[PDB]
Design a protein around this ligand. Structure first.
Ligand SMILES: CCCCCCCCCCCCCCCCCC(=O)OC[C@H](COP(=O)([O-])OCC(O)COP(=O)([O-])OC[C@@H](COC(=O)CCCCCCCCCCCCCCCCC)OC(=O)CCCCCCCCCCCCCCCCC)OC(=O)CCCCCCCCCCCCCCCCC
Ligand SMILES: CCCCCCCCCCCCCCCCCC(=O)OC[C@H](COP(=O)([O-])OCC(O)COP(=O)([O-])OC[C@@H](COC(=O)CCCCCCCCCCCCCCCCC)OC(=O)CCCCCCCCCCCCCCCCC)OC(=O)CCCCCCCCCCCCCCCCC
Ligand SMILES: CCCCCCCCCCCCCCCCCC(=O)OC[C@H](COP(=O)([O-])OCC(O)COP(=O)([O-])OC[C@@H](COC(=O)CCCCCCCCCCCCCCCCC)OC(=O)CCCCCCCCCCCCCCCCC)OC(=O)CCCCCCCCCCCCCCCCC
Ligand SMILES: C[C@@H]1CC[C@@]2(OC1)O[C@H]1[C@@H](O)[C@H]3[C@@H]4CC[C@H]5C[C@@H](O[C@@H]6O[C@H](CO)[C@H](O[C@@H]7O[C@H](CO)[C@@H](O)[C@H](O[C@@H]8OC[C@@H](O)[C@H](O)[C@H]8O)[C@H]7O[C@@H]7O[C@H](CO)[C@H](O)[C@H](O[C@@H]8O[C@H](CO)[C@@H](O)[C@H](O)[C@H]8O)[C@H]7O)[C@H](O)[C@H]6O)[C@H](O)C[C@]5(C)[C@H]4CC[C@]3(C)[C@H]1[C@@H]2C
Ligand SMILES: CCCCCCCC/C=C/CCCCCCCC(=O)OC[C@H](COP(=O)(O)OCCN)OC(=O)CCCCCCC/C=C/CCCCCCCC
Ligand SMILES: CCCCCCCC/C=C/CCCCCCCC(=O)OC[C@H](COP(=O)(O)OCCN)OC(=O)CCCCCCC/C=C/CCCCCCCC
Ligand SMILES: CCCCCCCC/C=C/CCCCCCCC(=O)OC[C@H](COP(=O)(O)OCCN)OC(=O)CCCCCCC/C=C/CCCCCCCC
Ligand SMILES: [Zn+2]
Ligand SMILES: [Zn+2]
Ligand SMILES: [Zn+2]
Lengths: 230, 107, 226, 124, 65, 121, 62, 120, 52, 196
């Protein structure tokens, strides 16, 4: 027989990661922060390596445990956006009569909605192929093109906007809510860059996580679009 | 709510007129701090500690059965102090039901 | 069982590359001296040699047929040991529910060691009480202090070892007549001729008996790039 | 699973015992001192030992330092009231050390009278 | 091994080196100093005295000391 | 009233006294308390009562003080904290003489009401 | 993979013998300082693979 | 009676403070040279080499315990055959006087009683 | 497979370790500084930490 | 009914002996299934086609022997001989003859108990029943006693609470007389101090 769980006795990434966090506080140059971020990325990858190596234990509950962890993380991301919506709507009584130019409801909203919908369709096709034990090379490069356009559009919008964060709480909330969504789009790039075909298929937690996360980002933008643009 | 096991009148009838409830002492004894021997090294002190576990003790009844140390929670079932690896074999929580299947019996 | 993961490819069959290259010694090794991989191929080579000889099957007794395939005839001792193994494995990830324990029929608590933690929850319905945990050690008939349910520890122990499927086989299975390599060759020629190989394990096995890389195409079969 | 971490393993025998040259068994550090003092009381307490058992737990004076052997010997309701008063008195004394001889003017009789005048005018 | 059965076996079997306990108490003592030392330093920085005299910020009688 | 009307299978003591017995006790000494009320060296077993003879379910009650001092010991033989006294002797007396119990409880309540009302008012 | 989708490797083709792979007692003397440096670099193959697949899109954004 | 006097002999008052002589007199930090004690220091504590510098969990001193047949040593029960039946005699723990010291006599009586439960 | 004796006789005859001596409340005030300034492994570690 | 109908493991066959799905990057070979169905025949069509196992005829005498020794097994062996056994028929045969392992309580060694102790089993059961009888009755007794005693706390709390009610009652009477009669109340009294 064997123990139900193969215990993990020792770990040293925790110390390294925690020290990396402290380096952000104790920096005397923003250049150190940039290089420190690479270290954090490296060590987080090692932690992800340990999760993949745990497959050797053949434990049925490992998939379930990680899936429910992601559910909790998703909830935290939703509640973080709720706080920004809370901040935005608290000062609702002070909006729409101040001498600032709010965003148009015709151009930005439509193309972004169309663009992000295509992103969902690409990920949906990836899920379908994952169900069918099949792969299509071009799909990943469609995501990169999709992400390239999103970055190009958002950069221009910020640069050409004629109002600034210090003009009103409305502008601050607009910029902040849009940035928060962008950061979650960038986190999606971090995840999707490693998409590959793995032959153990439906016992791979990465596929279900990516599908859930991409759907969350897109639905959040619908709420943002209704609140700010429409 | 729980109010003890149900008892039938016939179950209370003794087989002798001199039967009284057994006077067996359920005080396990007199204890204090576990006192180690200076001669015992680390390994042998560990054996000493393992032989002083109250949860390994019991009281033997008049029919040979023993009533062991029992606790409401499993926190009192590990060796004291707690070892690094406690439940190597999964503790079994015994449920009871009236269901039965024929394969278990023989005529 | 529900707590096991998906069957692996090896759970069905092993690749031929795992066949021991010294087949002549493999078929002469006693069962107690064969490892997991050696035992697997001994049974597969000997089992398939008898099954691929149709003309001899009807005259072969079930005892001999079972021996050739490596299947163990069941008896009360072996059945008892195997049954308690599966019960132990099942209880690893399943609930422990059964009839109320009494002196005549104590609750059986399988264990490998000398101790296992158990809880008593009383009887059914109103007789059910709060969990009462106790350490079930070997050699004592335990009596719950509340409901008077009787528990007993059953140890899966045998001669300085704990019961396992292989241990049961070694203890009770008896090696029969030594496998004859002539049968391997005879069956090999039956199903493998003129570049057609319908009996591939025998083709590899026969090649190893003749050394290695003697039969047609075996040199190319054994040459690898990495 | 064959080859997995065993569910049970027997302890290997302990390492060989060590004897000094003269044959005396070697002793090892032991943090169970025998405190030196004249107290020899032994207090026993019936203790829960599960749900159906108890154990008569004893505390021996020689296993405690002098300060506890002295305090634990006396009746609780003799020592307890004295300690409560003593601790409070010490606290007051400690805090009074830093203000010996400090005489603020606002607590002088003249200032006290002036406050009374203010209260009368303001009907406080 | 028997030595590895119990977590922190040396301490639990009462063989540990006393220095471990001293460090724990020292660490606690240092933590406490983080409330007292900056108090003294800040008092001197803004007043030139490590500690005030009681009621020194109020009017005092002539004989007050 | 557990022995009187609820359960008839526990030994029922005789009341030696409806008041506690005051005694000086010493730490480190074991005392044996009469649970039948028929010993002549109350509150201790005398060697001739039912407790001493182990008759009718009566056994001596072991007791040991933590510290030296003067302690109160049950005379009614039914105090919850037996051998020590906690007031059960008065309670058991009221059961036997409820009319007297009313007088004492009224008097005690009357005093408590006056003092509490006088100070707060 | 050694998971459900595959299985073990035949002994004929095993190249990392655990008896030599493990038993790391004295390993720093067996590889020297430069070998120690190489071992550190090769331990981060997993991190290296991610960066190769992650940098290019960032260059595009930049 | 005084139960401490029963096991006074076992408790010999100590000599050194905290149980160790000065390191100069005896170096308890070094690993013991006694055969079979290479994992222990001189004073009996586990050596840093065994637990930290060459910990087996890190790949040092690789030695798989399980054998070829997937078996590990297991100690059997104390079996007895009597009255046409195979019996197992359980291991009873040693007297609490040996482990704790007090002599197991004059134990206060605590009877068996089932759980105190609210009824009605 | 290793063979070991039941016991070993050490070459020296010094009883270096044993039960800890009785101590008072303030025994740590002198014993702790004594270890720092008198035990080799103590001040060697301190110097090593401070230097680097 | 699991994994959407895709088996975890299945056999694939190739026509070219030297074909490797990982080395070659050609685009003409079509893989086959376990029954030999080419991949470009969809499963909803191939699964309808009836596939039966054909053993060499030299196995017929053996299959006949199995049926005769085990008559319950005869109908399955006959299907196999006649080439009418599909995969489903084989599965039914396989699971029909699978039996569970048996555990014999008579082979379990028992914890040691002397003959004298074994004769006291009825007594110990008798004691246990009386403990339960005493336990259950005491629960009713204690429940009545203590829950009744709680009423004393209610009455004690009500009395002490009523003391503060009376104090508040007198306080309100006093306040009503402050502005009307109390000489402490003064008007045309406080004069502004003025800025210092
Ligand atoms: C006489 C010729 C007439 C030609 C007319 C023009 C037709 C152009 C079609 C372009 C479609 C691009 C679609 C992009 C999305 C991704 C497609 C995809 O999945 O590809 C998979 C495909 C194969 O992927 P796989 O993983 O191997 O296989 C996956 C499947 O299993 C198997 O995949 P699959 O085989 O099922 O793929 C189906 C299909 C799925 O996609 C579609 O079917 C979408 C079709 C959308 C039509 C868009 C037409 C746009 C035209 C606009 C013109 C506007 C003029 C304005 C004038 C203004 C005047 C004032 O994908 C493709 O076929 C993609 C195009 C393949 C070409 C690759 C070679 C390089 C580019 C060659 C371009 C040649 C143009 C000649 C023009 C001549 C005119 C006379 O990917 C590749 O081949 C690799 C990457 C390259 C593909 C994209 C190439 C873009 C070329 C754009 C040309 C038009 C530019 C117009 C500019 C106008 C400026 C004003
Ligand atoms: C709230 C309070 C009241 C609470 C009441 C209620 C309490 C209820 C009970 C609670 C119980 C909870 C459960 C307890 C379980 C205990 C388990 C246990 O013992 O585990 C074993 C564990 C370790 O035992 P082991 O297994 O033998 O470990 C062996 C080692 O791993 C290996 O041995 P090794 O010798 O190789 O060790 C290596 C050693 C190497 O050792 C050496 O080399 C030592 C050398 C000597 C150094 C000595 C310090 C020198 C300081 C000099 C200061 C100079 C100041 C100059 C000022 C000048 C001013 C003008 O150390 C190191 O290399 C690293 C040391 C790093 C840690 C220490 C850091 C110290 C502070 C540093 C401050 C830095 C400040 C910088 C700020 C700068 C800002 C800019 O024990 C401990 O660690 C000690 C625990 C002690 C307490 C046990 C519990 C007793 C009950 C509680 C008592 C009351 C405590 C009250 C709090 C403290 C008050 C102060
Ligand atoms: C006749 C006497 C007088 C009668 C008065 C009647 C009044 C009406 C009540 C209804 C009629 C009752 C008639 C009962 C007949 C008997 C029936 C029966 O079954 O008898 C046998 C039955 C059982 O017989 P058994 O089974 O044989 O056992 C008998 C044993 O003796 C065992 O007996 P036991 O176990 O039942 O013992 C009872 C004991 C059991 O109690 C405990 O075990 C208590 C344990 C926790 C103690 C916690 C202490 C406090 C903690 C404070 C936290 C802060 C600390 C600050 C520290 C600062 C630094 C030092 O109860 C108490 O000690 C009473 C506690 C009451 C609450 C205490 C808090 C009062 C707060 C008031 C408001 C404060 C506002 C302040 C405003 C500003 C200043 C003025 O016995 C009884 O029923 C005995 C009942 C006697 C109760 C008398 C309690 C009087 C307490 C007066 C408090 C006055 C407060 C004044 C200030 C007010 C300001 C507003
Ligand atoms: C209407 C306009 C037309 C012009 C244009 O925009 C829309 O067409 C777009 C499309 O073509 C874009 C490309 C899509 C494919 C992208 C591929 C990406 O490289 C890949 O990125 C790594 C991480 O993503 C890995 O993937 C790795 O695999 C690597 O290769 C590269 O970093 C940028 C990339 C090339 C993109 C550059 C910008 C583009 C060319 C865009 C180009 C401006
Ligand atoms: C500031 C806001 C936040 C951004 C800053 C960094 C935050 C870093 C926090 C990261 C938390 C990660 C939690 C992961 C939990 C889920 C893990 C999981 O399921 O992984 C396994 C899963 C599937 O593996 P299998 O082997 O198939 O199965 C596993 C066993 N059954 O694998 C994956 O998810 C693959 C992940 C690959 C991509 C990894 C990329 C890591 C990115 C780290 C970002 C760090 C950026 C730091 C920036 C700092 C400066 C701003
Ligand atoms: C049909 C689809 C849409 C459904 C929408 C459901 C909305 C649910 C809202 C839940 C929270 C309700 C809080 C109580 C309402 C209070 C509203 C209010 O008073 O607003 C004004 C007030 C500010 O006024 P004063 O502080 O007095 O002065 C301000 C001066 N500058 O604003 C607030 O405090 C309200 C802020 C909270 C509301 C916005 C954020 C919370 C809502 C998040 C929703 C998330 C998405 C939907 C989740 C549910 C999906 C099923
Ligand atoms: C002008 C007037 C000044 C008046 C000053 C009055 C000062 C009064 C101080 C009263 C408080 C005294 C607190 C005493 C704390 C004792 C702490 C203690 O016991 O520590 C225990 C702990 C663990 O010991 P054991 O548990 O025995 O371990 C062995 C195995 N069991 O002991 C230690 O760690 C020993 C060392 C601890 C650090 C103590 C010293 C810290 C440094 C103090 C510096 C003081 C400087 C004063 C400068 C004054 C200038 C005018
Ligand atoms: Zn029970
Ligand atoms: Zn008596
Ligand atoms: Zn009384």
């Amino acid at each position: 027989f064997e123990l139900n769980i193969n215990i993990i006795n020792y770990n040293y990434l925790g110390i390294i990661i925690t020290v990396i966090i402290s380096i952000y506080i104790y920096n005397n140059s923003n250049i150190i922060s940039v290089y420190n971020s690479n270290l954090l990325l490296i060590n987080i990858n090692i932690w992800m390596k340990y999760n993949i190596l745990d497959m050797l234990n053949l434990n049925v509950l490992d998939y379930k445990i990680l899936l429910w962890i992601v559910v909790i993380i998703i909830s935290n991301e939703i509640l973080l956006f709720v706080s920004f919506y809370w901040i935005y709507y608290h000062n609702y009584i002070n909006y729409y009569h101040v001498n600032i130019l709010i965003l148009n409801s015709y151009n930005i909203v439509y193309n972004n909605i169309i663009l992000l919908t295509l992103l969902s369709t690409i990920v949906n096709i990836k899920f379908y192929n994952y169900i069918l034990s099949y792969y299509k090379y071009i799909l990943s490069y469609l995501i990169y093109y999709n992400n390239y356009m999103f970055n190009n559009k958002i950069i221009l919008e910020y640069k050409n906007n004629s109002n600034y964060t210090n003009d009103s709480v409305y502008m601050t909330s607009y910029f902040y809510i849009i940035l928060l969504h962008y950061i979650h789009i960038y986190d999606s790039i971090i995840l999707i860059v490693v998409y590959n075909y793995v032959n153990y298929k439906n016992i791979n937690n990465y596929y279900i996580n990516i599908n859930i996360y991409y759907h969350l980002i897109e639905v959040l933008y619908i709420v943002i679009s209704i609140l700010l643009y429409l | 709510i729980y109010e003890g096991q149900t008892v039938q009148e016939s179950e209370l009838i003794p087989q002798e007129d001199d039967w009284v409830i057994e006077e067996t002492n359920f005080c396990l004894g007199r204890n204090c701090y576990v006192r180690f021997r200076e001669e015992d090294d680390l390994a042998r002190r560990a054996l000493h500690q393992m032989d002083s576990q109250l949860n390994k003790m019991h009281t033997r009844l008049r029919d040979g059965t023993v009533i062991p140390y029992m606790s409401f929670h499993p926190d009192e079932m590990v060796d004291r102090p707690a070892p690094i690896h406690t439940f190597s074999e999964k503790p079994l929580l015994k449920w009871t039901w009236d269901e039965t299947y024929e394969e278990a019996y023989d005529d | 069982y529900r707590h096991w993961h998906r069957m692996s490819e090896d759970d069905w069959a092993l690749p031929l590359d795992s066949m021991p290259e010294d087949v002549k010694t493999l078929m002469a090794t006693p069962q107690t001296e064969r490892g997991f991989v050696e035992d697997y191929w001994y049974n597969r080579i000997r089992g398939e040699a008898t099954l691929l000889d149709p003309e001899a099957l009807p005259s072969k007794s079930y005892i001999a047929l079972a021996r050739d395939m490596g299947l163990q005839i069941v008896d009360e001792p072996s059945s008892h040991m195997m049954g308690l193994i599966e019960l132990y494995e099942y209880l690893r990830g399943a609930s422990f529910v059964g009839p109320f324990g009494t002196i005549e029929n104590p609750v059986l608590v399988p264990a490998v060691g000398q101790e296992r933690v158990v809880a008593c929850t009383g009887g059914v319905g109103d007789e059910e009480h709060f969990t009462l945990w106790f350490r079930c050690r070997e050699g004592f008939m335990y009596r719950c202090g509340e409901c008077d349910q009787i528990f007993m520890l059953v140890r899966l122990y045998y001669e300085d070892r704990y019961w396992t499927q292989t241990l049961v086989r070694d203890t009770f299975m008896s090696d029969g007549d030594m496998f004859d390599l002539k049968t391997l060759e005879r069956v090999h020629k039956m199903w493998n001729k003129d570049e057609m190989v319908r009996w591939e394990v025998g083709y590899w096995a026969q090649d190893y008996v003749l050394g290695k890389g003697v039969l047609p195409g075996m040199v190319e079969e054994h040459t690898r790039v990495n | 699973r064959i080859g997995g971490p065993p569910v049970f393993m027997q302890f290997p025998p302990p390492p060989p015992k060590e004897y000094l040259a003269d044959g005396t068994p070697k002793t090892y550090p032991l943090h169970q001192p025998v405190f030196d003092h004249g107290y020899t009381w032994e207090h026993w307490y019936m203790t829960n030992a599960g749900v159906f058992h108890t154990v008569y737990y004893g505390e021996f004076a020689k296993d405690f330092p002098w300060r506890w052997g002295f305090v634990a010997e006396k009746p609780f309701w003799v020592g307890a009231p004295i300690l409560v008063l003593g601790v409070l008195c010490l606290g007051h004394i400690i805090q009074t050390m830093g203000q010996i001889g400090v005489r603020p003017k606002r607590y002088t009789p003249e200032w006290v009278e002036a406050t009374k005048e203010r209260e009368r005018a303001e009907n406080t | 091994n028997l030595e590895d059965h119990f977590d922190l076996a040396e301490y639990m079997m009462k063989m540990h080196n006393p220095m471990s306990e001293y460090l724990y108490w020292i660490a606690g003592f240092v933590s406490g100093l983080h409330g007292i030392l900056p108090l003294l330093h800040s008092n001197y920085y803004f007043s030139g005295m490590f500690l005030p005299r009681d009621n020194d910020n109020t009017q005092l009688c002539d004989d007050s000391w | 009233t557990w022995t009187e009307i609820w359960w008839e299978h526990d030994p029922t003591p005789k009341v030696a006294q409806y008041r506690p017995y005051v005694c000086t006790v010493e730490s480190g000494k074991v005392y044996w308390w009469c649970a039948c009320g028929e010993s002549k060296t109350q509150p201790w077993v005398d060697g001739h009562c039912k407790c001493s003879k182990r008759e009718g379910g009566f056994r001596p009650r072991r007791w040991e003080p933590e510290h030296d001092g003067v302690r109160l010991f049950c005379g009614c033989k039914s105090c919850f904290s037996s051998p020590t006294w906690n007031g059960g002797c008065f309670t058991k007396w009221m059961q036997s003489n409820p009319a007297g119990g009313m007088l004492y409880c009224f008097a005690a309540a009357f005093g408590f009401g006056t003092l509490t009302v006088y100070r707060k008012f | 993979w050694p998971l459900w989708c595959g299985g073990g490797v035949p002994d004929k083709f095993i190249k990392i013998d655990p008896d030599v792979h493990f038993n790391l007692q004295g390993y720093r003397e067996r590889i020297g300082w430069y070998g120690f440096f190489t071992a550190f670099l090769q331990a981060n193959y997993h991190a290296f693979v991610y960066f190769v697949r992650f940098i290019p899109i960032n260059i595009a954004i930049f | 009676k005084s139960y401490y006097d029963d096991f006074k002999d076992r408790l010999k008052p100590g000599k050194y403070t905290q149980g160790r002589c000065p390191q100069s007199e005896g170096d308890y930090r070094q690993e013991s040279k006694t055969i079979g004690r290479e994992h222990l220091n001189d004073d009996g504590t586990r050596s840093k080499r065994y637990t930290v510098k060459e910990a087996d969990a890190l790949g040092y001193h690789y030695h798989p315990p399980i054998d070829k047949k997937g078996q590990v040593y297991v100690k059997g029960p104390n079996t007895v055959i009597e009255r046409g039946q195979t019996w197992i005699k359980g291991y009873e723990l040693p007297s609490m006087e040996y482990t704790y010291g007090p002599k197991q006599e004059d134990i206060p009586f605590y009877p068996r009683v089932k759980l105190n439960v609210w009824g009605n | 497979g290793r063979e070991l004796p039941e016991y070993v006789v050490l070459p020296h005859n010094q009883q270096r370790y044993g039960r800890d001596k009785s101590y008072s409340y303030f025994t740590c005030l002198w014993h702790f500084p004594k270890m720092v300034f008198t035990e080799k492994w103590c001040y060697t570690n301190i110097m090593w930490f401070v230097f680097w | 009914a699991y994994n959407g109908g895709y088996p975890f493991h299945y056999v694939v066959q190739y026509d070219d002996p030297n074909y490797d799905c990982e080395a070659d990057f050609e685009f003409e070979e079509i893989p086959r299934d376990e029954f030999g169905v080419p991949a470009h025949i969809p499963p909803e069509l191939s699964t309808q086609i009836r596939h039966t196992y054909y053993v060499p005829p030299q196995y017929y005498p053996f299959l006949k022997k199995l049926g005769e020794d085990t008559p319950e097994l005869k109908p399955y062996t006959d299907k196999l001989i006649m080439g009418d056994m599909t995969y489903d028929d084989y599965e039914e045969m396989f699971y029909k003859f699978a039996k569970p392992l048996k555990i014999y309580r008579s082979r379990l060694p028992l914890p040691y108990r002397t003959d004298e102790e074994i004769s006291q089993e009825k007594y110990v059961n008798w004691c246990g029943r009386w403990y339960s009888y005493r336990q259950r009755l005491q629960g009713d007794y204690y429940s009545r006693h203590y829950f009744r005693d709680w009423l004393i706390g209610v009455m004690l709390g009500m009395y002490l609470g009523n003391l503060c009610v009376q104090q508040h009652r007198q306080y309100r009477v006093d306040m009503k007389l402050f502005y009307l009669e109390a000489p402490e109340h003064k008007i045309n009294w406080v004069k502004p101090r003025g800025d210092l």
